[PDB]
Symmetry: D2
Subunit: 308 residues, 4 copies
Amino acid sequence: KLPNIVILATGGTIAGVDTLINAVPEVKKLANVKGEQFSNMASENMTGDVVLKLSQRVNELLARDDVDGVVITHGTDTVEESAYFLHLTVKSDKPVVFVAAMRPATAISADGPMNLLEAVRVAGDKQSRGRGVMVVINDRIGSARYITKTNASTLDTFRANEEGYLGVIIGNRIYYQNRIDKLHTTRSVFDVRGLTSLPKVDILYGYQDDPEYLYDAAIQHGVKGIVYAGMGAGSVSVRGIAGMRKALEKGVVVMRSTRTGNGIVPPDEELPGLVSDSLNPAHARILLMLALTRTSDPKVIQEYFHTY
Amino acid sequence: KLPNIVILATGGTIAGSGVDTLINAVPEVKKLANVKGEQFSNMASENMTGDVVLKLSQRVNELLARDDVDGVVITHGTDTVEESAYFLHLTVKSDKPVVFVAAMRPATAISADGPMNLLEAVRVAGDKQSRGRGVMVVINDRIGSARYITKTNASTLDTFRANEEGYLGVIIGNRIYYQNRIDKLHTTRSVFDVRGLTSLPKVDILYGYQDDPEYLYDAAIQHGVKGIVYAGMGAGSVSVRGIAGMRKALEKGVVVMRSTRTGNGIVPPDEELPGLVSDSLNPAHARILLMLALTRTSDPKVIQEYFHTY
Amino acid sequence: KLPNIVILATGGTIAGSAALGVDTLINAVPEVKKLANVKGEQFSNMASENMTGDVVLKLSQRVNELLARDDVDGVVITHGTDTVEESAYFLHLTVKSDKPVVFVAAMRPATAISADGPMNLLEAVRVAGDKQSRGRGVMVVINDRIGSARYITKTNASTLDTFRANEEGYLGVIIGNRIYYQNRIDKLHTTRSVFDVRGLTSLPKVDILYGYQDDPEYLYDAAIQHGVKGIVYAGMGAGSVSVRGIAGMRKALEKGVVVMRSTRTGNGIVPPDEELPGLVSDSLNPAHARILLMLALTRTSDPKVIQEYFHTY
Amino acid sequence: KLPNIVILATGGTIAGSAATGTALGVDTLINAVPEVKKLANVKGEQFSNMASENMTGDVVLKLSQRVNELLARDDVDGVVITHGTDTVEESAYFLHLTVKSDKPVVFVAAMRPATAISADGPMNLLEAVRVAGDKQSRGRGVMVVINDRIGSARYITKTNASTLDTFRANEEGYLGVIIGNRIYYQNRIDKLHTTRSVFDVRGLTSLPKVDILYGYQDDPEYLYDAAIQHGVKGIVYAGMGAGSVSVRGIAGMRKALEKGVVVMRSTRTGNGIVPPDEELPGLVSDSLNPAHARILLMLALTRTSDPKVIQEYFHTY
Ligand SMILES: N[C@@H](CC(=O)O)C(=O)O
Ligand SMILES: N[C@@H](CC(=O)O)C(=O)O
Ligand SMILES: N[C@@H](CC(=O)O)C(=O)O
Ligand SMILES: N[C@@H](CC(=O)O)C(=O)O
């Protein structure tokens, strides 16, 4: 009866992998679980080269006939970045479910145990296939493309204000609500098998008195892309625009996102750079880095931003 | 009979295709108040700068000192209204209403929001019950505190929200409904005296994200910044590279303030990390309070206390 | 060639003044004529609080007929905000077409300063005429948002941004004259729905009873005595029932009335609980639950079949 | 000196015990969070032990009188009330109107039973005790503390059937939050409550009867008749939109008013303002939801049946 699920641990407040498994032995009634310790770091230290390797490992795991799904334990701070990277790069319809905890395993009313039990339920459910990469936490199933950590510190921090959840887990039952209307996983062009490094992309904030010199510094340190976390709908001050023009003059791809938290940065013929659609800055950086593995053609990169 | 309101125009999409053109388009405002328009500036708010917001604050302070001004409405772009409004929230030494207003659609647009926004803002500014509430941002039938309200969406009419703090009030059916008073210091109780000042200590904002680079901290230090606000991962969590950058800044006397990129909530104290914490201030609000904090002191404990009280 | 869109008007504040015919709404936003070849048809002209099942049934049947024509590519239905979620979910279950069906409404009357209706209607016509809008289920378009009829609800008495689906989000948004589609609903609707209402002229009676401290058994008695076929309970919490409500429900079940337990809370799942009477409404709110229950009772009174509809529609 | 906090237990899922991790007395709640001893000197008192869907006005009245008695004592600094989540908003708003003290009254609840994996009640209870015992918490009105949030009784509502984060005040936010063992107070409510409320229920043992009727397509007039015949003193209408009323509902309302029943138009929508409309029967609920509006109406009817006086209470409380 039971699905074969690998729990691949990377670190996080949620935390070895076998302690997490033995600490929530109820997972063993939902799936035949095998723990693998991939890494053990706080997610604020997760790096692209490690995420690239995580993607390659999960691709290897899901190519096996004896693996039905993977649960990846991770820190909450950057789970949206790791999850979106896998969303673009894992070429399987078998479920990939990131899980995390906002309270440490030792805290009163720690959320990790239930989050993990939910994540294993989701990863093992046959109805979970072909949905894109998911983040499960606090009874919710979020798409990697939409979900984001919206609050510094609360248990219900992961939300997608405009897109909602793919599903919810209540009373030990999964309720699937939406399928994302975007490309991912088995329909994505972002194959990264045997890449070993990724194009450098920095994120610069927009705000009153924002300085041009941060652009100059990024250019000088060899960035290939800049994601702008812009005022409003990717609006730019005279200083930012001077900086973006310098970047473009020097061969950098400029992507205008928003610092607001939500919503669409629309095309604008009268401003430099590309536009991020509804990708926030963290997600935009991940798609831009992957885009630059394939192309430097701004029309092609822009169309990825509208479709992924 | 009527309240005397000054409409001080700074620019923004609310005036997008003069202040008297905005007034003449909403002649209904004249039944709520005796309005006078003044054109302070005309710029998109992405170009608003501290030096200009200083002048704005000084002008509004001057106006509110006058018997013949009951309140001020400030028309502004949406993109950085939260920054301008929080600056005035900290520096305007009057209990008379100061109401920032804006529009997400240009004045020419089908179902443009500016006309009703402006009428609501004039109602709020003239209402006797509006006194002593701190600076306000009025848009889309909502009254937001300058300390909590933020532009949460790039493009929608209902973008201004304070998810955890709610609205001070709402305007429905031509009546104001006051819900909350902010439990923070502001306006007449503020220490932030900016009379005589013409510029402000330099503070930049650096983002937190996977692979964030140390060299941006170096660049900021080299350019003479007095403060760095960090728009951190999670609860102001810092990578190894960020910590290195922050330790370099602290050694050079830069005040480092850890906020969050998430959008909401509390960055709690953590003695094992560098720098101060931003309480519930988002990075744009944190920059504004940190610049004003540095007009009084560089002492980290004093600044941290401002951050827990303003 | 522009899409051919019928604008079917039913009333609402969108046509209110401080009433207006469909051609006036159209002519107040002449931009709609650049997006589509529009034909206005006045179906009704009432406030939506007065919209009734028998009329919604006729609306559905008319829209079904229209969308079977080769010269109609989609329909926009102007309606009051107050019960648009009920009309829209009814059509979502009963219109057997993939062509777009887009309800639109306005929170401010047409005469109001910064009236919302003009942009709402333009957006609605854009949505209805886009080929990418096909096969999505019935939609409610307002305030730059495209809500599924199955999830969207009026969440605020009085604001422009009242239509939200907190847990399910929007199907799409309309920004800068462009449609951004985000989600497809994972539920049955329209061309995959079993709820055929061709030929019908009336629907089984279903009332909604509220749950709250001191809630009285006598409202159950009254509904039962008046011949209701179903009772939707707008329950405390997750369809929780007081001793009085349980007494009332057991009376109803004795008389063959189908009891459906929803929630007054506004959102989320009422889970199965074999210890309590009645069926459970999944994530359907009470207004939506009533619409699905009325239609279910046209086909079955088997509680298991009804329960499965509530988990799949 | 630590504050003296009474934990007054009334039931709820916070005190629930299921078969497995996928009824309880107060001292069991207290003993599962021994950390509470460092925040306060706590004493447990068992007021009731029921599911909150069974809480009744007559018992809520007794609860308020007990809390009033407790807070009059010098040796009581604050009270925490453990309760079911389903009608906590009703009991809390009742006390918010009738507790004549500035000392903290903090309702607390839990969405998962005590036996559940990652049960929320232990931390909810600790946070409620911290809030009740903090000197900064006085004079804030009655509070509901759950999931790191401090909600005013006047605004807070259960918005979701089943999630941990269900308690929200979408338009009014939280009074405060509790993060890292520290309280952050954000707002003071701009409404009358507690020591400034006219609603004294010291002598009473019951309240005027008020029922709630829903608004929806095809809503039936006969439920108005039924209510009137069962002796209601008020009807709260959970109306369509902004308290909009069908022709059937208007006929029902008019019959109610003829019989001296006070009709209060609220909204089913979940949030926002039901504005005055002289063209419609009855009064309007301001931003009070139906459950809150019923509580205020019952208390209003202990003092007056003057619709003007009742309307003004609804704009001020
Ligand atoms: N800093 C932690 C926070 C968490 O997991 O809640 C991490 O991201 O590893
Ligand atoms: N970029 C404009 C946007 C607006 O006002 O909606 C501004 O901030 O001036
Ligand atoms: N009562 C009106 C309100 C609206 O349309 O906004 C209706 O539903 O017809
Ligand atoms: N039905 C329970 C639900 C809860 O406590 O969460 C009660 O309200 O007592």
